[PDB]
Homo-oligomer: A and B are copies of this chain.
Amino acid sequence: YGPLFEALAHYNDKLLAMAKAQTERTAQALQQPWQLIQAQMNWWQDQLKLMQHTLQPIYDYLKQSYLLTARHLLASVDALEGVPQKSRERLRFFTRQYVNAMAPSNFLATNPELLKLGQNLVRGLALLAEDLERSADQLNDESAFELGRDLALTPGRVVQRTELYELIQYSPTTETVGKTPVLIVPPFINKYYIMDMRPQNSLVAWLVAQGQTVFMISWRNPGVAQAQIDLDDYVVDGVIAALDGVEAATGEREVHGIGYCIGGTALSLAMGWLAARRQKQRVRTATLFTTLLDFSQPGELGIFIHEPIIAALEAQNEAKGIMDGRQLAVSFSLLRENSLYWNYYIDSYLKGQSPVAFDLLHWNSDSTNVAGKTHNSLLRRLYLENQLVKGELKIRNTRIDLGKVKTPVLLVSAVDDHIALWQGTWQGMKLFGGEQRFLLAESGHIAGIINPPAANKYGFWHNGAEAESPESWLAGATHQGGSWWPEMMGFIQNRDESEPVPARVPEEGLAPAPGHYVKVRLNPV
């Protein structure tokens, strides 16, 4: 009631400064036009002023509000006349993507009718699923983005290709690198290049610039041929087999592990599997981004965790062979940042960059399938039964006890995370039997994790002392502005300290940097 007016004025001043800057650059000579953003900023201010004026009358506001959207339509299209049609079509496609992404009814997890809704609930769930998927198909233009050119362009080589993954080894870009390599295990629900989007916000590029040999697992988009691949296979044949692949290319049997969402869960299970069978420690440090080990707080995804629903999904998976990612794309959204338009479209434009919200929407729509047996194990053994905390989880007939893991773990979570609640991630940290550290990012599931140091856009909470509850941890935590990536880099290099080793140049391998598994789309472009 007031701060909105002041904050809106601040954004208008930055656009006016950018408008003057664009005129000065045009003077030296003698993308979206600033008039298009001005058309939107004019709507936000006038609507707030009209609302303040109001603070038959309902109709008067409706008529006056309808006049403001009409002014918004006329000013926007007028700005798009000098823009070429191909670039303009890109803007129309992404705006259609963004406008449907912000509708809670468009996703089952946030759908009102599903919340309103035994067998009758299961039958109605299928009705909501088929309608949303049909709407997505008709909406889903082409030539949006090409991997290796616009996204996932960090130089490297594919040093190994298995049934489940392609192992990417990135170019060093430094004269010296650390002895212990870095292995990143991305989630197999979406594609990995969220950590390798663009050079300014690519986590892979930043880790490489810090003198570290970075390896990235690139999971295959599973087809019907991978119907029997289970969670056990992704742990043993996925993560551990990648560890053997890193040793085969660098000669180091010990690496720094990094995991994201369910990828960190697989990394945790791999460390528990090696520990339970008394194998020499192959993971020196383990950084886990928004990883869920205790599934007691599933968040909005708990609407699906019910015996009739899970039993129905298990039958569907076994019938179709795999879980169709296009069905998962309407089930929930991994990208739900608060004020995506303000912080990643308006702010990203005023920084001279191509709108980051465009890249985020393309990654969110680059859905991937899940193996039939894997999804079921993930639904039942982890989300429903919560075997990992109860010590009942078995990976290839090996009971997993994370207390047997002595690898120092660093859990980096996000306060506004809607997929992996930070409190839930905090409880799973105590499961480990070694050093434990916790970090709490300021933004959401995606924005709070991909915050490069240069952006200086958010912050984090750190606390070295132990607490008995997440609320107690945060109460004693100290806030630090900026990115937490240097803190993670300090967490890795303060425990290996090892003499620097000459930069490992990747071998030619089988394929160029991005690989082939990441380019396989469910809806081909």
Contact = CB atoms under 8 A, between A and B. Distances in A.
Given A4-B59, A524-B277, A47 B65 contact: yes
A203 to B, nearest CB: 27
Contacts of A68: 69
Contact of A73 (B4, B47, B73, B162): B73
Contact of A95 (B51, B63, B70, B142): B70
A384 interface: no
How many copies of the polypeptide does the oligomer hold?
Answer: 3
Interface string A56-90: 10110111011111111110110000000000000
Given A59-B4, A73-B72, A74-B95, A397 B66 contact: no
Nearest to A61: B51
Contacts of A67: 99, 102-103
Interface string A30-44: 100000000000011
Given A47-B62, A161-B30, A99 B72 contact: no
A229 interface: no
A192 B2 CA distance: 50
A58 B1 contact: yes
A54 to B, nearest CB: 10
B4 A277 contact: no
B92 A341 contact: no
Given A277-B523, A523-B277, A524-B278, A62 B74 contact: no
A522 interface: yes
A163 B524 CA distance: 29
A454 interface: no
Given A48-B62, A62-B48, A74 B99 contact: yes
Contacts of A1: 56, 58
A71 B69 CA distance: 11
A236 interface: no
Contacts of A129: none
Contacts of A69: 43, 68-69, 72-73
A58 B51 contact: yes
A276 interface: yes
A27 interface: yes
Interface in A112-143: 142
A10 interface: no
A20 interface: no
Contacts of A59: 4
Interface residues of A, number: 47
Interface centre among A30, A47, A56 (most CB of B within 10 A): A30
B278 A58 contact: no
Nearest to A276: B524
A306 interface: no
Interface string A388-414: 000000000100000000000000000
A268 to B, nearest CB: 19
A77 B102 contact: no
A14 interface: no
A397 B95 contact: no
A276 B61 CA distance: 43
A351 interface: no
A479 interface: no
Interface in A498-525: 522-524
Contacts of A51: 58, 61-62
Interface centre among A47, A142, A276 (most CB of B within 10 A): A47
Interface in A260-295: 276-278
A62 B72 CA distance: 14
Contacts of A65: 47, 65
A344 to B, nearest CB: 14
Contacts of A4: 56, 58-59, 62
Nearest to A166: B30
Contacts of A163: 30
Interface in A1-27: 1, 3-4, 27
Contacts of A96: 74
26 contacts: A1-B58, A3-B56, A4-B59, A4-B62, A27-B161, A30-B161, A30-B162, A47-B65, A47-B66, A51-B58, A51-B61, A51-B62, A65-B65, A66-B341, A67-B99, A67-B102, A69-B72, A69-B73, A70-B95, A70-B99, A74-B92, A77-B77, A142-B397, A276-B524, A278-B522, A278-B524
Closest 3 CB pairs of A and B: A69-B69, A70-B99, A73-B73
Interface of A: 1, 3-4, 27, 30, 43-44, 47-48, 51, 56, 58-59, 61-63, 65-74, 76-77, 92, 95-96, 98-99, 102-103, 142, 161-163, 276-278, 341, 397, 522-524
Given A44-B66, A72-B73, 4 more contacts: A48-B62, A63-B341, A68-B69, A277-B524
